[PDB]
Amino acid sequence: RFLKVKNWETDVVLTDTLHLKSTLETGCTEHICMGSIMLPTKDQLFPLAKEFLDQYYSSIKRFGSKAHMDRLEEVNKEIESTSTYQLKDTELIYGAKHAWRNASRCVGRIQWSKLQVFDARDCTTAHGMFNYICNHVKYATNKGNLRSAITIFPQRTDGKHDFRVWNSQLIRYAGYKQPDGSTLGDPANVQFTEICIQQGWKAPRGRFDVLPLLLQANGNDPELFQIPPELVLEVPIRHPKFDWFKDLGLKWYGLPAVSNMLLEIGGLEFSACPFSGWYMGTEIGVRDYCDNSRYNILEEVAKKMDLDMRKTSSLWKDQALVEINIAVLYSFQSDKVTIVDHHSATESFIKHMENEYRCRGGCPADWVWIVPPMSGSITPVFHQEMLNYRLTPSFEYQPDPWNTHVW
Amino acid sequence: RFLKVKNWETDVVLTDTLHLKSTLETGCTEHICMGSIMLPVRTKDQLFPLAKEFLDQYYSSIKRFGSKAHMDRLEEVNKEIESTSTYQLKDTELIYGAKHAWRNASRCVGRIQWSKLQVFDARDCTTAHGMFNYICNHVKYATNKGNLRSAITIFPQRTDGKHDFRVWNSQLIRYAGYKQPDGSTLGDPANVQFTEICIQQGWKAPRGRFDVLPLLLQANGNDPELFQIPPELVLEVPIRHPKFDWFKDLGLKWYGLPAVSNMLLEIGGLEFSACPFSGWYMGTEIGVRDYCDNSRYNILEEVAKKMDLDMRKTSSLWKDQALVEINIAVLYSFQSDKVTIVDHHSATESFIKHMENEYRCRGGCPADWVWIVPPMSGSITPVFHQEMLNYRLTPSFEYQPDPWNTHVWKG
Ligand code: HEM
Ligand code: HEM
Ligand SMILES: CNCc1ccc(-c2cncc(CCc3cc(C)cc(N)n3)c2)cc1
Ligand SMILES: CNCc1ccc(-c2cncc(CCc3cc(C)cc(N)n3)c2)cc1
Ligand SMILES: C[C@H](O)[C@H](O)[C@H]1CNc2nc(N)[nH]c(=O)c2N1
Ligand SMILES: C[C@H](O)[C@H](O)[C@H]1CNc2nc(N)[nH]c(=O)c2N1
Ligand SMILES: [Zn+2]
């Protein structure tokens, strides 16, 4: 019941007591571990609200106080009456920051308390959504000095009036299936790109076309908007030693901004809550550029390096992988756009874990996602035991809109 | 119940039914996952059903389930348990059990080879000297002059837990570690404590950076005894780099034969506390973990120095760059000396084929993603994108406590 986690590189042992406050389920049982699986009413609402308000008032050292009991009272009344309730600005900011704090798959959580929360609950139309999102993008980008931010749109009511951003990320590149049979641009976005076209987009059918926003307000049919190009900061990718690297024509966007998740706070559901931080290098260089189901450029780069691609045991893939990731970091740094390498980011996370164990009694963590997709065991997180569990407030996955939307 | 796993690179979906045959616990609950945790005297009472379950599995596999031979054997084992409080496996059952323990090892990426295992029955062994002989023969057989062959040697099963056979070495072949007065370490830092035990037991340490440790062998619950493996039986490989001529001057070598000797083999409820087994290396075990872990030989610095990489900013990825060259050298060196080794690309590709095969013919393949994905270049290998279910089947290999913590010394 009081669990220990060991670091096998440093022999340091931490005791987790925070997991006892876990509410949601893991997918695992005593018979089977699903640790590597990607996706494993009035009555219900009040205890959820209560649990949240309890931890909120605890956090501001006013547990069991007049203000605490009064607020509990007021929300209890509002639920009984309106079948839902509205968060105070203070509770919203707290809940959003803690949703990030609780994101067990996020390596960047040392920054959790420095989140800019944009309250967009007064939004009523897709054009308003577009305005709010442009402002978010401009604020977060900050001319390359990236700042964490989240924009929170109205909460779900009867499920028939959902606000949704249909894009998976605010900024991503289009994908087109070729008559050649191959794929132009980002293969991961072919389906979404078609929906844009099926909704009326005018695709420039290029390799790095920034997708339009598909925004859905109040359960209405979604609408298309183009983000002002001058708000999308991009970085041309070059290598500090290989001059030929630029001729690959590679670039990527500066702002990683997830827009398809659901923010749960005190039982309330925010179906549209785009949030953003800044990249860890490997997200671009390892996953985006080198996955076989993505831009898959390993072979092209290896060839330019004149490596022996006869035998896998020459580790040509590995050698090119490193150089690509060198170039990404180099390119971002040179253009003064915030980025963190996997060594720095994972070192930060260990320090954050130790902070969380000390001041909170634990830190939920998903090793499968926290360990970088290259060079894993030379980062300190590899040797760090982690316990994974689900605390609320939380970011949750939700069904893709097109599979749900009643047109 | 049915369980699906998805490969996110290929969209291949597989259905697991084998997990229904799972008995042991995982450590996880509905409220916590312990998937990244390293480590999460038996009465006749609990022994009959474990024996029965195993023999049902055995006779099913040979297509003789429910036969008179099956029924006679159950009867025979039953009587033997209630008479003697234990029982003995037939040779056929032992071989089956050992192969299936490997087949079931959810942390092992090399399992495509599970059916080709050489099983050495040492259940007639009675002394440490006899253990030494059996282990020498295993090492010679497995090594096969560099053409490695998988093998396992099985010493007598536990009885009352007061007469255990144990190999005190974690692996049959390993280098000594010496903690210096100034706090530095000579040799392999992982083996400092075991080295000290050996020294206390009378081992004369050469005190070099690559001294092969003596065997410390315990038979029938007696105090362990020291034995030196004949050097001519210990195949080693000098590490050099195909393009970097200064790499040889680092003075590195490694042994060819990975042989785990501290685990417990469970078969039909019986416990084999000494069951050394060996295969061949995947490159990264040596080049990533053995050489580059901060808690091991830790040579990233010197290699990066000699490469003249920019070492002031970690964002130069000088650590990653050095790591790759070292792993190139390890593979190159083994291949050049014709000692069996497999790169992490080949090994993970084979495991996926194995896994898919197992789903089709067996209804599953328990696998621990945390261990299966290699310690470098994870997502450019096919296993990274593969969803896996982890559960525990028997026969199995299990961890057991270090013997120096539990042994009652005779004197
Ligand atoms: C500011 C610097 C940040 C860094 C360096 C960072 C880093 C990462 C990385 C590398 C991942 C793995 C995701 C993948 O590989 O696809 C991740 C996941 C995640 N991050 Fe963070 N992140 C940052 C900011 C944030 C912020 C501001 C939030 C929320 C307010 C957040 C919430 C999450 C969540 C919920 C996941 C899981 C995503 C999923 O399941 O798809 N992150 N992060
Ligand atoms: C024949 C080629 C083999 C290869 C390439 C291979 C590969 C590996 C690797 C890379 C690991 C992880 C090692 C680590 O990082 O500590 C491992 C673990 C393991 N292997 Fe295999 N192995 C092979 C043979 C065998 C054999 C013959 C057996 C048993 C008969 C076996 C049983 C296991 C077990 C039980 C583990 C888990 C170790 C632990 O929990 O500490 N393997 N294997
Ligand atoms: C085959 N899979 C392709 C694919 C899968 C998942 C994703 C993805 C989708 N949504 C979110 C992410 C998380 C990335 C992220 C988010 C944030 C806030 C910061 C950061 N550094 N990185 C990743 C992209 C592409
Ligand atoms: C971190 N302390 C050093 C260390 C600790 C444990 C191990 C280790 C422990 N148990 C099992 C292993 C398996 C290694 C292996 C075994 C076999 C049969 C084949 C193979 N290729 N590799 C390795 C190695 C090194
Ligand atoms: C804490 C964590 O589970 C530990 O470092 C694991 C990670 N994955 C591993 N994978 C392999 N093959 N071998 C290991 O020793 C480890 N160590
Ligand atoms: C199947 C496996 O869980 C899947 O490939 C995971 C592994 N680890 C990951 N880790 C991160 N950070 N992001 C991912 O998308 C994944 N994918
Ligand atoms: Zn689990």
Explain what this protein looks like in three dimensions:
Chain B: Keywords: Calmodulin-binding, Cell membrane, Cell projection, FAD, Flavoprotein, FMN, Heme, Iron, Membrane, Metal-binding, NADP, Oxidoreductase, Phosphoprotein, Synapse, Ubl conjugation. Chain B: It is found in: Cell membrane, Sarcolemma; Cell projection, Dendritic spine. Two copies of one chain form a homodimer. With about 400 residues, the first copy, chain A, is an alpha+beta fold. Chain A has three domains: about 160 residues, Nitric Oxide Synthase, Chain A, domain 1, CATH 3.90.340.10; about 100 residues, Nitric Oxide Synthase,Heme Domain, Chain A, domain 2 (Alpha-Beta Complex); about 90 residues, Alpha-Beta Complex (Bovine Endothelial Nitric Oxide Synthase Heme Domain, Chain: A,domain 3), CATH 3.90.1230. Helix content of chain A is about 35%, strand content about 15%. In chain A, the strands form seven sheets. A four-stranded mixed sheet of chain A has the order 3-4-15-12, with helices on both faces. Chain A has a three-stranded antiparallel sheet with strand order 5-8-9, covered by helices on one side. The first copy, chain A, has a three-stranded antiparallel sheet with strand order 14-13-18. The longest helix of chain A has 19 residues. The complex binds protoporphyrin IX containing FE (HEM) (2 copies), the ligand CNCc1ccc(-c2cncc(CCc3cc(C)cc(N)n3)c2)cc1 (2 copies), 5,6,7,8-tetrahydrobiopterin (2 copies) and zinc ion. One 5,6,7,8-tetrahydrobiopterin sits at the interface of chains A and B.
